[PDB]
């Protein structure tokens, strides 16, 4: 699936940043039994990578009902949501520090039982720079 | 061979491979495909049940080839046994005796009923 | 759930065979995924559940689990495979990763 | 010398999946119990012995089948009901009188110009709507679901109250029930008994607290698939029920509005008496004791010296952050922060605020949304509460304070608790064995 | 006892009370429940009928226990008769034969057919 | 005669015309007529199969009338043979013994299973 992502961003320390990841024509599945469209139970994961070191996991949003879950050491300053009408997912990171500057990826997870924590399609990556 | 393999063969050849083709007699929402499949399945089951009951009434249930006790009236076909068993195919033989088919079924049913009643009478003593 | 990866970096010439080791402090079963990131390029999955190939990846990568040890064999290396390999488990991710480059 | 022999009626089963039918013992209700075949008063439950069977609650097919079945029942029930397309019109909405501090702007007095009986003249008609059911553009408001999906109003005659349904496999199939009280989610169950129909299953609709469930026969039980996983929801099953009341103290009166030739739409008319917030009452001592039991049984999976902290929901849509459930015909979304606030370490009743929505789109379906009809008079619904849907938040390996929050959302996890001890087996009555006989 | 009563029991107890579960092999608008129940009933009848097919092709129709005339090839299971009939329940036996069913099934039918043919050739005299 | 022809007749006539009234036990969109017809056909098949399975359990499959091995307890009925078979209709006899049917069916089932087991054990020689 195509995962468009927002353009690069620059913010000041102590501000908030908003990153949007769009996955057109992928929020809905077919339930052939009822023969009706439903909202899929996919998980939109969010990953971050500082320049030089390996990736890190921020959170994920199950889009079926907007359920979320964040990493322990980011809790209290990151909010994750999705808009099913626009088929997009929004990451709102608040109170960025100097070390929070990095490239952020949105990842798509089919949430299949057989393969736990699998990301298939990745966004182009949005680089966010924080400084004064 | 397999299913219907020896259909055009002789009575002699075909009369020994009954099982290979008798075995294959039995092998969602309310959409068009679903209802068609369900109707087809129940129709196949009904046809097989009709045939099995027809076997059962003449006391041949569970027998591929059973012997009977009703004489073969030559009016149906006066051809020699060897001729019909060494040259024809089953389709031709069936076509020949198509119109003489209900009568033999009735004779078979009456003969089996009479034989069963006689057997019960004998088993009484 | 601590996850570590070895070696920190390695190098191999064209067409060789290499292995990368991932050690998980717990018995997480077969739920291991490995991800490859070319420099200046978002990473893409190549192996999931540690023994089943991802869509659209050449068959030269073959995974394997020996207890808590996880590794895959990379054969006949060609120079579009130079990059960074990370082994991810569950929520955790391997710090650093392994950098593979030609010599 | 030895020869084979067939053995009809052999007791051999295999794992299989097959459609099962409902059966309930006897007013129309949303579950077509008038179509279920009646169940016998005395089910012929048969105990077994010396038999061990592997059970996998998380790969069970019965749960998915019954979830699909419930979805179909819901869709077919609301299909032949009055449409509500004309309601998508401009609304002139004002703030509403005798209201306490918990209803500041919650209720909106909205008037529109719905057509009268004959489709040529407009008539000014007023009604009341809940703030979660309107969106601003006195001011102008529109129904919240007027730009994404159409609205259909459930017929007021049919009730949404859950009714027990027994699941019966077809002829030639059996349902294996595991009576092992200590049996966790997945594994062999030594004490397994066959049956033809399942026990009373109440298709309840809830997200955070498993209302009106089935209690475990021993100490509180915790179940999960790969409990190491954060994502996988952690099923809980209480030994002793935790009473809960969750009433609405208002006295709203229904009013009929003729929106077409015969199709009538029911609206919340004037409210007789004052207005008070809907609330849930839970006896604090019992809830505290239940939490103590659950944390005692939860320390086993992590260690005796670990720390367990109950935190409220992380966030998301209204149907997940708060405890959402049906009662009497009205949907409730109740703030659950009052419960999951404890920080367990090695008379009075708690009250949970609630809010009421009238557009319901559970099992999100792009194109349809139910308008819950108003219910006249006060509503009270005692509920037993049997299980929770907790999810372990992630944790850095340095610290050892696991935090549990009441997640959920998916109804499959909700329903896996009621079918946790059931499996479907296909009988194979044919077998071959060696024997000294030799047929003549 | 009751249905599947001797499911875990040994060979001997099960082989004495077959009929308790043989007898329990067989026991409106177009809504969801209606179509679900109809499919369930048709499927049950079809499964029982396939079972009856396999029994009839072996010439044991109507018999819970019937004997055959084919050798027990040791390649399937060369284990002592007494330990088989005093140790292993039917389930474990199936789990140790499940790979080898089809072939023996075919053998059965073939032998049966051959036997029938021979019987007919004997009875013509 | 015909279907149900001997219904008013005594035992003597009825017990000889079983086949004539056993021959007719078995003889596409989602419209009301269509679904009614489909349910009717499935119901007929299910009833026939239930009766046939009951026959097969008692080891009398393929036979119109079969003899058994359990005696007639006078508790069921004390009426002598002669007036039973020359005096009353089948319907009257059925109404007379209707409330005793389950236990006698169970007796036949158990006796047939026991006889089959004994025959197998004897054949083991
Ligand atoms: C978990 O399980 C509990 C079971 O205890 C459920 O509790 C039931 O909830 C329903 C839903 O409200 C209750 O049904 C209501 O009962 C009211 C009381 O009825 C009694 O008293 C009147 C006299 O006042 C008698 O006439 C009557 O026979 C009863 O003895 C009724 O007044 C309500 O009537 C409304 O609905 C009916 C149709 O059912 C309409 O005809 C009326 O006009 C009116 O609109 C209603 O019937 C029920 O009483 C509760 N208890 C029991 C034992 O069932 C929980 O709801 C359930 N929770 C979940 C989440 O599933
Ligand atoms: C929601 O708003 C509507 C519209 O205002 C309210 O209905 C209106 O209520 C008033 C109450 O004063 C009615 O006024 C009438 O006044 C005459 C005398 O002038 C009196 O004799 C009547 O008994 C009545 O009080 C008015 O007719 C009525 N309808 C309209 C169209 O205005 C409604 O009460 C509001 N509901 C809530 C909960 O606030
Ligand atoms: C966690 O999940 C993994 C896989 O999702 C389980 O590993 C087993 O993997 C094999 C692969 O062939 C499957 O056949 C088994 O069914 C899996 N086991 C189970 C119980 O499903 C692993 O067992 C799970 N549990 C733990 C504690 O790791
Ligand atoms: C349907 O209408 C709703 C209500 O206005 C829209 O939701 C709002 O969208 C705006 C867009 O910037 C947001 O700022 C608001 O926060 C949204 N409201 C809520 C309650 O979330 C929705 O986008 C509309 N959908 C379409 C397809 O037009
Ligand atoms: C549920 O109980 C079963 C019992 O067999 C557990 O399965 C094994 O249990 C033993 C000891 O209890 C462990 O050493 C094994 O690792 C378990 N195997 C697997 C595949 O889990 C099972 O773990 C229990 N599950 C839970 C969630 O408690
Ligand atoms: C809730 O409102 C209803 C509807 O009025 C009340 O039921 C009747 O109310 C009228 C006046 O509105 C009284 O004259 C009747 O006597 C009431 N019927 C009774 C009491 O059976 C109902 O009383 C209101 N609820 C409360 C708690 O006051
Ligand atoms: C839920 O508990 C609250 C606790 O305050 C109850 O509210 C009180 O109810 C009594 C009942 O007579 C009133 O006298 C009080 O004025 C109410 N408020 C307070 C602050 O005490 C409420 O009634 C309970 N509801 C249910 C359904 O149990
Ligand atoms: C929930 O409501 C029920 C019914 O109103 C309460 O149970 C009754 O409470 C009263 C008041 O103490 C007792 O006199 C009764 O004996 C209780 N039982 C019954 C059947 O009426 C229950 O206490 C409420 N739960 C709370 C307040 O947490
Ligand atoms: C969970 O609890 C937190 C605090 O314990 C709640 O956070 C408050 O949220 C409200 C509005 O949602 C804000 O006005 C407060 O400023 C917040 N306070 C803090 C300390 O965060 C949160 O709302 C609760 N969530 C739910 C679903 O109950
Ligand atoms: C749910 O209940 C919690 C209980 O704390 C509410 O949180 C408080 O909300 C009030 C607003 O009435 C604030 O003044 C407090 O600062 C909040 N405290 C905390 C610790 O968050 C919360 O607002 C309620 N509603 C939701 C949606 O969470
Ligand atoms: C389950 O196993 C036990 C022992 O393996 C069986 O007990 C046998 O019962 C018979 C019937 O009286 C005795 O003759 C045997 O001596 C018992 N076994 C032993 C080892 O003494 C039991 O029958 C089996 N089946 C059930 C349903 O419990
Ligand atoms: C077809 O005809 C040939 C001609 O002799 C014969 O040998 C053969 O058996 C017949 N049947 C088949 C199936 O070939
Ligand atoms: C609950 O019980 C524990 C001990 O069982 C006690 O320490 C605590 O004060 C009680 N109340 C709450 C709200 O935790
Ligand atoms: C709740 O649990 C108790 C426990 O005994 C049970 O008696 C009762 O029927 C259950 N349901 C209700 C509505 O109380
Ligand atoms: C009706 O009863 C009379 C009694 O005399 C008998 O002769 C006659 O045969 C009976 N009818 C039939 C059709 O058997």
Ligand nearest to the CA of D384: 14
What is the spatial distance between Cα A104 and Cα A8, in angstroms, rounded to a whole number? Answer: 10
Contacts of B65 (CB under 8 A, 6+ apart): B15, B18, E116, E117, E120
Nearest residue by C-alpha to atom 3 in ligand 9: D312
Assess whether chains B and A touch, using the rule of 3 or more C-beta pairs within 8 angstroms.
Answer: yes
| Phi–psi pair at F49, nearest 5 degrees | -65, -40
Of F58, F79, F52, F62, the C-alpha closest to F70 is: F58
> Which residue out of E6, E19, E67 would a mutagenesis test of the F interface target, given it has the greatest number of F Cβ atoms within 10 Å?
E19
User: Strand locations in D137-293, DSSP E?
Assistant: 139-143, 150-153, 166-168, 173-178, 186-189, 192-195, 209-210, 221-223, 234-237, 252-258, 264-271, 279-283
Residue E36 structure tokens: 């679900």
Cross-strand partners of C10: C100
D178 CA distance to ligand 11 middle (Å):
22
Residue F1 structure tokens: 């005669």
Q: Is D178 exposed, middle or buried (0-12, 13-18, 19+ CB in 10 A)?
A: buried
Ligand 7 test: best mutation among D100, D277, D281, most atoms within 8 Å of CB? D281
Cross-strand partners of D280: D352
Contacts of D363 (CB under 8 A, 6+ apart): A38, D71, D74, D411
Distance in Å, alpha carbon of E88 to nearest chain B alpha carbon: 32
> Which residue out of D364, D396, D409 would a mutagenesis test of the A interface target, given it has the greatest number of A Cβ atoms within 10 Å?
D364
Q: What share of chain F is helix, strand, coil (3-state, %, to 5)?
A: 65, 0, 35
Ligand nearest to the CA of D381: 1
E52 CA distance to ligand 2 middle (Å):
77
Number of structural domains chain D divides into:
1
What is the spatial distance between Cα D267 and Cα D316, in angstroms, rounded to a whole number? Answer: 29
- Chain C residue with the nearest C-alpha to that of D396: C1
Residue F25 structure tokens: 């036990």
Distance in Å, alpha carbon of B31 to nearest chain E alpha carbon: 11
* HEC per residue, C50-70: CCEECCCCCCCEEEEEECCEE
CB-based contact, C43 to chain A, within 8 Å? yes
B10 CA distance to ligand 12 middle (Å):
8
CB-based contact, A113 to chain C, within 8 Å? no
What is the spatial distance between Cα A20 and Cα A90, in angstroms, rounded to a whole number? Answer: 5
Residue D146 structure tokens: 């007027």
**Three-class secondary structure of residue D200 per DSSP:** coil
In a domain, D112, yes or no: yes
Query: Tokens 């397999």 sit at which residue?
Result: B2
List Cα–Cα distances, F101 to D439, F95, F106, in angstroms. Answer: 34, 11, 9
Of A44, A41, A57, A72, the C-alpha closest to D393 is: A72
Of B71, B58, E37, the C-alpha closest to F38 is: E37
Show the DSSP H helices in D25-132 as ranges: 61-78
Ligand nearest to the CA of D294: 13
* F26, F28, F64 member nearest B113 (Cβ): F64
- Collect all residues of chain F within an 8 Å Cβ-Cβ radius of residue E22: 57
What is the spatial distance between Cα D424 and Cα D347, in angstroms, rounded to a whole number? Answer: 46
Q: How many CB atoms lie within 10 A of CB C89?
A: 25
Alpha carbon distance, N-terminus to C-terminus of chain E: 50
The CATH number linked to D290 is 2.170.40.20
What is the spatial distance between Cα D281 and Cα D7, in angstroms, rounded to a whole number? Answer: 61
CB-based contact, F22 to chain B, within 8 Å? yes
At B12, which helix (H) or strand (E)? Answer: helix B11-14
What is the spatial distance between Cα B100 and Cα B89, in angstroms, rounded to a whole number? Answer: 18
User: Are the beta carbons of F124 and D436 separated by less than 8 Å?
Assistant: yes
D34 CA distance to ligand 14 middle (Å):
26
Residue D262 structure tokens: 């015969």
What is the spatial distance between Cα F47 and Cα F18, in angstroms, rounded to a whole number? Answer: 18
List Cα–Cα distances, D216 to A82, D210, D268, D285, F5, in angstroms. Answer: 37, 13, 41, 20, 62
**DSSP one-letter code for A117:** S
Taking a C-beta distance cutoff of 8 angstroms, is the pair A111, A124 a contact? no
User: Are the beta carbons of F56 and E48 separated by less than 8 Å?
Assistant: no
> Which residue out of F46, F53, F57, F123 would a mutagenesis test of the D interface target, given it has the greatest number of D Cβ atoms within 10 Å?
F123
Taking a C-beta distance cutoff of 8 angstroms, is the pair D36, D22 a contact? yes
In a domain, D439, yes or no: no
Alpha carbon distance, N-terminus to C-terminus of chain F: 50
Taking a C-beta distance cutoff of 8 angstroms, is the pair A49, A130 a contact? no
Residue D303 structure tokens: 């260690």
User: Strand locations in D34-120, DSSP E?
Assistant: 53-56, 91-95, 107-112
D217 CA distance to ligand 13 middle (Å):
25
CB-based contact, A111 to chain C, within 8 Å? no
**DSSP one-letter code for A113:** S
In a domain, D90, yes or no: yes
**Three-class secondary structure of residue D274 per DSSP:** coil
**Does ligand 10 come within 6 angstroms of the Cβ of D351?**
no
In a domain, D155, yes or no: yes
**Three-class secondary structure of residue D324 per DSSP:** strand
- Collect all residues of chain F within an 8 Å Cβ-Cβ radius of residue D440: 123
Cross-strand partners of D40: none
- Collect all residues of chain D within an 8 Å Cβ-Cβ radius of residue E41: 170-171
**DSSP one-letter code for D58:** G
> Which residue out of C91, C95, C99 would a mutagenesis test of the A interface target, given it has the greatest number of A Cβ atoms within 10 Å?
C91
**Three-class secondary structure of residue D387 per DSSP:** strand
Supply angle C-alpha D2, E106, E99, rounded to 5.
75
Buried b (16+ CB within 10 A) or exposed e, C91-103: bbbbebbbbbeee
Of D283, F58, D14, the C-alpha closest to E95 is: D14
Cross-strand partners of C24: C3
**Three-class secondary structure of residue A126 per DSSP:** strand
**Three-class secondary structure of residue F110 per DSSP:** helix
List Cα–Cα distances, C46 to C86, E11, F49, in angstroms. Answer: 11, 51, 56
Q: Is C58 exposed, middle or buried (0-12, 13-18, 19+ CB in 10 A)?
A: exposed
- Chain F residue with the nearest C-alpha to that of E12: F117
In a domain, D440, yes or no: no
Subunits in contact with chain C (3 or more CB pairs closer than 8 Å): A, D
Domain that holds residue D406: 4-434
**Three-class secondary structure of residue C92 per DSSP:** strand
Helical packing angle, B32-57 and B101-124, nearest 10°? 50
Of E23, B96, C4, the C-alpha closest to D171 is: E23
Nearest residue by C-alpha to atom 8 in ligand 15: F9
Query: Tokens 């491979």 sit at which residue?
Result: B17
Contacts of B57 (CB under 8 A, 6+ apart): B109, B112, F19, F22, F23, F64
A28 CA distance to ligand 15 middle (Å):
76
Query: Tokens 């030799």 sit at which residue?
Result: D438
Of D362, D326, D24, the C-alpha closest to D163 is: D24
- Chain B residue with the nearest C-alpha to that of A34: B29
Residue C102 structure tokens: 């030609």
* A57, A119, A122 member nearest C91 (Cβ): A57
Of D211, D249, D275, D257, the C-alpha closest to D351 is: D249
Contacts of A3 (CB under 8 A, 6+ apart): A21, A22, A23, A106, A107, A108, A121, A122, A123, A124
Distance in Å, alpha carbon of D44 to nearest chain F alpha carbon: 17
CB-based contact, A30 to chain D, within 8 Å? no
Sheet with D150-153: list strands edge to edge: D150-153, D368-371, D359-360
Residues in A 10-39 with any Cβ partner in C closer than 8 A: none
List Cα–Cα distances, D26 to D32, D66, D166, D202, F27, in angstroms. Answer: 12, 21, 12, 15, 36
D216 CA distance to ligand 14 middle (Å):
13
Taking a C-beta distance cutoff of 8 angstroms, is the pair B28, E39 a contact? yes
**Does ligand 12 come within 6 angstroms of the Cβ of B14?**
no
Which is it for strands D209-210 and D91-95: parallel, antiparallel or unpaired? unpaired
Which is it for strands A126-130 and A9-11: parallel, antiparallel or unpaired? parallel
Residue A132 structure tokens: 């004064």
CB-based contact, B32 to chain A, within 8 Å? no
Contacts of B68 (CB under 8 A, 6+ apart): B58, B108, B111, B112
CB-based contact, A110 to chain C, within 8 Å? no
CB-based contact, B30 to chain A, within 8 Å? no
Contacts of A80 (CB under 8 A, 6+ apart): A46, A58, A59, A60, A61, A68, A70, A89, A90, A91, A92, D315
Subunits in contact with chain E (3 or more CB pairs closer than 8 Å): B, D, F
Ligand nearest to the CA of D190: 5
Sheet with C18-24: list strands edge to edge: C3-6, C18-24, C69-74, C61-66
List Cα–Cα distances, F48 to B7, F23, F42, F52, in angstroms. Answer: 32, 12, 10, 6
Alpha carbon distance, N-terminus to C-terminus of chain B: 50
Residue E21 structure tokens: 């579960």
* HEC per residue, E31-77: CHHHHHHHHHHHHHHHHHHHHHHHHHHCCCCCCCEEEEEEECCCCCC
Ligand 7 test: best mutation among D347, D349, D378, D383, most atoms within 8 Å of CB? D349
Residue D148 structure tokens: 């994404």
D352 CA distance to ligand 10 middle (Å):
11
Residues belonging to chain A: 132
Taking a C-beta distance cutoff of 8 angstroms, is the pair B59, B116 a contact? yes
Distance in Å, alpha carbon of E20 to nearest chain F alpha carbon: 9
D184 CA distance to ligand 5 middle (Å):
8
Q: Which technique was used to obtain these atomic coordinates?
A: cryo-EM
């Amino acid at each position: 699936v195509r995962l468009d992502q927002s353009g690069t961003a620059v913010k000041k320390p102590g501000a908030s940043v908003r990153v949007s990841c769009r996955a057109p024509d992928s929020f809905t599945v077919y339930r052939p039994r009822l023969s009706a469209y439903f909202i899929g139970e996919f998980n939109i994961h969010w990953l971050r990578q500082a320049p030089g070191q390996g990736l890190e996991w921020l959170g994920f949003v199950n889009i079926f009902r907007g359920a979320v879950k964040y990493s322990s050491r980011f809790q209290g300053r990151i909010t994750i949501t999705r808009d099913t009408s626009s088929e997009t997912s929004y990451l709102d990171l608040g109170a960025l520090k100097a070390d929070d500057t990095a490239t952020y990826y949105c990842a798509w997870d089919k949430n299949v039982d057989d393969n736990p924590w699998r990301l298939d399609s990745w966004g182009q990556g949005t680089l966010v720079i924080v400084s004064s | 061979l397999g299913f219907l393999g020896a259909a055009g063969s002789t009575m002699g050849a075909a009369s020994m491979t009954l099982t290979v083709q008798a075995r294959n007699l039995l092998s969602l929402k309310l959409t068009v495909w679903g209802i068609k499949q369900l109707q087809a399945r129940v129709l196949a089951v009904e046809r097989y049940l009709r045939d099995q009951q027809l076997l059962g009434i003449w006391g041949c249930s569970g027998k591929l080839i059973c012997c009977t006790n009703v004489p073969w009236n030559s009016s149906w076909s006066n051809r020699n046994l060897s001729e019909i068993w060494d040259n024809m195919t089953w389709l031709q033989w069936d076509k020949e005796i198509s119109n003489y088919t209900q009568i033999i079924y009735g004779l078979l049913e009456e003969s089996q009923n009479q034989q069963e009643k006689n057997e019960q009478d004998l088993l009484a003593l | 759930i601590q996850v570590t990866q070895s070696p920190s970096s390695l190098s191999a010439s064209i067409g060789d065979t290499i292995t990368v080791a991932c050690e998980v402090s717990q018995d997480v079963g077969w739920a291991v995924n490995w991800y490859h990131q070319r420099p200046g390029r978002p990473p893409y999955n190549l192996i999931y559940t540690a023994h089943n190939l991802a869509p659209g990846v050449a068959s030269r990568f073959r995974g394997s689990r020996v207890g808590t040890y996880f590794t895959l064999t990379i054969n006949n290396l060609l120079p579009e495979d130079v990059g960074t390999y990370y082994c991810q488990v569950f929520d955790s991710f391997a710090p650093g990763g392994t950098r593979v480059d030609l010599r | 010398n030895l020869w084979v022999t067939v053995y009809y009626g052999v007791p051999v089963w295999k794992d299989a999946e097959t459609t099962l039918f409902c059966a309930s013992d006897a007013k129309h209700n949303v579950w077509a119990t008038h179509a279920c075949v009646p169940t016998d008063p005395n089910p012929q439950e048969i105990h077994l012995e010396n038999v061990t069977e592997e059970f996998n609650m998380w790969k069970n097919n019965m749960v998915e089948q019954m979830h699909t079945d419930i979805i179909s029942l819901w869709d077919q029930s609301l299909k032949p009901c009055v449409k509500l397309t004309p309601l998508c019109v401009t609304l002139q909405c004002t703030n509403v009188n005798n209201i306490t501090d918990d209803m500041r702007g919650e209720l909106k007095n909205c008037s529109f110009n719905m057509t009268t009986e004959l489709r040529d003249k407009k008539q000014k008609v007023y009604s009341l709507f809940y703030r979660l059911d309107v969106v601003q553009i006195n001011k102008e408001y529109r129904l919240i679901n007027c730009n994404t999906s159409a609205i259909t109003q459930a017929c007021p005659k049919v009730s949404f109250e859950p009714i027990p349904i027994h699941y019966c496999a077809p002829a030639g199939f059996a349902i294996l029930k595991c009576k092992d009280k200590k049996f966790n989610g997945t594994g062999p169950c030594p004490s397994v008994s066959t049956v033809q129909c399942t026990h009373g299953i109440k298709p309840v609709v809830s997200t955070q607290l498993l209302l009106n469930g089935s209690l475990a026969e021993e100490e509180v039980m915790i179940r999960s698939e790969n409990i190491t996983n954060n994502a996988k929801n952690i099923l809980v099953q209480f030994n002793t029920p935790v009473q809960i009341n969750c009433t609405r103290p208002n006295n709203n009166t229904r009013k009929s509005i003729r929106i077409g030739p015969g199709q009538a739409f029911y609206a919340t008319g004037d409210i007789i008496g004052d207005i008070r917030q809907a609330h849930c009452n839970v006896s604090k001592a019992t809830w505290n004791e239940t939490l103590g039991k659950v944390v005692k049984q939860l320390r086993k999976h992590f260690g005796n010296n670990t720390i367990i902290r109950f935190a409220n929901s992380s966030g998301g849509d209204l149907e997940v952050t708060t405890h959402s459930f049906n009662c009497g015909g009205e949907f409730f979304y109740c703030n659950t922060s009052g419960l999951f606030n404890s920080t367990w370490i090695s008379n009075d009743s708690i009250t949970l605020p609630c809010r009421i929505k009238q557009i319901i789109n559970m099992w999100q379906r792009i194109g349809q949304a139910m308008y819950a009809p108003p219910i006249q008079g006060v509503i009270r619904c005692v509920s037993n509460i049997t299980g929770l849907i907790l999810t372990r938040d992630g944790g850095s390996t340095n610290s050892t304070t696991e935090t549990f929050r009441p997640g959920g959302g998916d109804m499959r996890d909700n329903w896996r608790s009621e079918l946790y001890k059931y499996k479907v087996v296909k009988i194979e009555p044919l077998g071959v064995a060696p024997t000294r006989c030799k047929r003549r």
